Design a protein around this ligand. Structure first.
Ligand code: SRM
Ligand code: SF4
Ligand SMILES: O=S([O-])[O-]
Ligand code: NA
Length: 441
């Protein structure tokens, strides 16, 4: 795995990793991860390779919103993600987030800097701390937890705050994850120590709201005459398939593209900063390579972790299960006349929770081969943990349940109402209000 703050990778870097994947690995693939970086699988030299193109391999990749609606905020947000990443160089997870997009899934992370603007210019961050999704099956002492608001800081305090949070967690950690430390000592206690160490006092939270977590598939207009093309890549798995030479297509795009690529937190890839006059050339390659094959809104909003064959911790298939599972889900959405809708639906291969099922509207958490715990009642924006609905069930049982529930949603939903919110309103599942205490029935 590569260090790659904000998912930004140059085309020269892309060509190098393309070569290495094809020649020096068992699997031959580039796998985009949901933390805005890439992995090789079955390495057969490697760090030498990364170093040769300026890449290096406690803290994890720092995420940054990939394709903000206010395009002019990206540059400075990314600069700060990079600065934080470099500052924390010698598990802890950090993001920089640009409202109203929560593509980076802030509630899965120990530390989150929510960008605040004054005049289309970044002025500071709200700090949210203590998210983390891992659980141990049946262990009510473990839980997924969302992140808690600490307050606002001007830009000048960013690095000192980042360091204060990371060291406070390292030091106070047992169950050692920030979420557990926060619950044990109290949010106010942790916050006061961060203030002490960073030499600051947090200001009141400044207003922010999120509206979604998805990528912006297709072309969007960026700043100036630039355009960004987001390509949906199923499971982020880049390999040439029959009729769909994804890996070759991306290499060809890398050869002619004038800007960089951006790996998204949804395991997709953005061809970023394309001049308008170059759109047709780029699109032609993408289309002909299968990179722009249309999928349903549902598939665009579904995700799985790697799981088998490479993950030594896997309990059930995730990545390999997802394409056919979503074929079946697409069939259910079509059955019920909601093919244009989506349900944030995620499959994680074990309870460690990499697939971020514990922030989904519908989450499947692997328990054993072919068996998953089915969780319901997250929301579209990812601010609520979904309670377990059915335990240790197979795909046919999951589909039978979802057929019934999606059917009810289609008939009974209010205008614009998400499936997760609906399951809560309709009393199908009880919401989780305070995970450390009420996640587990
Ligand atoms: C690739 C990825 C999933 C994906 O399909 O995209 C992944 C894959 C693995 N994760 Fe993860 N995690 C990935 C995001 C996550 C996230 C989601 C996120 O961060 O946005 C979580 C849940 C959030 C959280 O941290 O609470 C996550 C929580 C874990 C945990 C649980 C840690 C804990 O708090 O208890 C483990 C297990 C461990 O560390 O012991 C883990 C362990 C693993 C390992 C390294 C298995 C291992 O320890 O040997 C996985 C390697 C599988 C493989 O063969 O590639 N991974 N993992 C993600 C790579 C991110 C990256 O580039 O750094
Ligand atoms: S969730 Fe479990 S199975 Fe999936 S990648 Fe993470 S550790 Fe492996
Ligand atoms: O990649 S996971 O282990 O954070
Ligand atoms: Na994807």
């Amino acid at each position: 795995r590569c260090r790659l703050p904000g998912g930004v990778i140059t085309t020269k870097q892309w060509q190098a990793i393309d070569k290495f994947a094809g020649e020096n690995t068992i699997y031959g693939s580039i796998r985009l991860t949901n933390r805005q970086t890439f992995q090789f699988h079955g390495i057969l030299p490697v760090h030498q390779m990364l170093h040769s193109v300026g890449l290096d391999a406690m803290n994890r990749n720092v995420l940054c919103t990939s394709n903000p609606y206010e395009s002019q905020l990206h540059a400075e947000a990314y600069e700060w993600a990079k600065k934080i990443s470099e500052h924390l160089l010698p598990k802890f997870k950090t993001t920089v987030v640009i409202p109203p997009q929560n593509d980076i899934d802030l509630h899965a992370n120990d530390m989150n800097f929510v960008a605040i603007a004054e005049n289309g210019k970044l002025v500071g961050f709200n700090l949210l701390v203590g998210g983390g999704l891992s659980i141990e099956h049946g262990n009510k002492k473990t839980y997924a937890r969302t992140a808690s608001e600490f307050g606002y800081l001007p830009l000048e305090h960013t690095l000192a705050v980042a360091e204060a949070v990371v060291t406070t967690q390292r030091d106070w950690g047992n169950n050692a994850k920030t979420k557990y430390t926060l619950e044990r000592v109290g949010v106010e206690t942790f916050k006061a120590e961060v203030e002490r160490r960073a030499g600051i006092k947090f200001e009141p939270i400044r207003p922010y709201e999120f509206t979604g977590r998805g990528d912006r598939i297709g072309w969007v207009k960026g700043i100036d005459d630039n355009w960004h093309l987001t390509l949906f890549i199923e499971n982020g798995r880049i390999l040439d398939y029959p009729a769909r030479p994804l890996k070759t297509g991306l290499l060809e795009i890398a050869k002619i593209h004038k800007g960089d690529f951006r790996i998204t937190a949804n395991q997709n890839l953005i061809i970023a900063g394309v001049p308008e006059s170059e759109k047709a050339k780029i699109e032609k390659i993408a289309k002909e390579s299968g990179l722009m094959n249309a999928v349903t809104p549902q598939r665009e909003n579904s995700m799985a972790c790697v799981s088998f064959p490479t993950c030594p911790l896997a309990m059930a298939e995730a990545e390999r299960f997802l394409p056919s599972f979503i074929d079946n889900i697409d069939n259910l959405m079509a059955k019920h006349g909601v093919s244009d809708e989506h349900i944030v639906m995620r499959v994680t291969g074990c309870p460690n929770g990499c697939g971020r099922a514990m922030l989904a509207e519908v989450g499947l958490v692997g328990k054993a081969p072919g068996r998953y715990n089915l969780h319901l009642g997250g929301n579209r924006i990812g601010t609520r943990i979904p309670r377990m609905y059915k335990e240790n069930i197979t795909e046919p049982e999951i589909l039978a349940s979802l057929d019934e529930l999606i059917g009810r949603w289609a008939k009974e939903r209010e205008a614009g109402e998400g499936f997760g919110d609906f399951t809560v309103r309709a009393g199908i599942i009880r919401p989780v209000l305070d995970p450390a205490r009420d996640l587990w029935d």
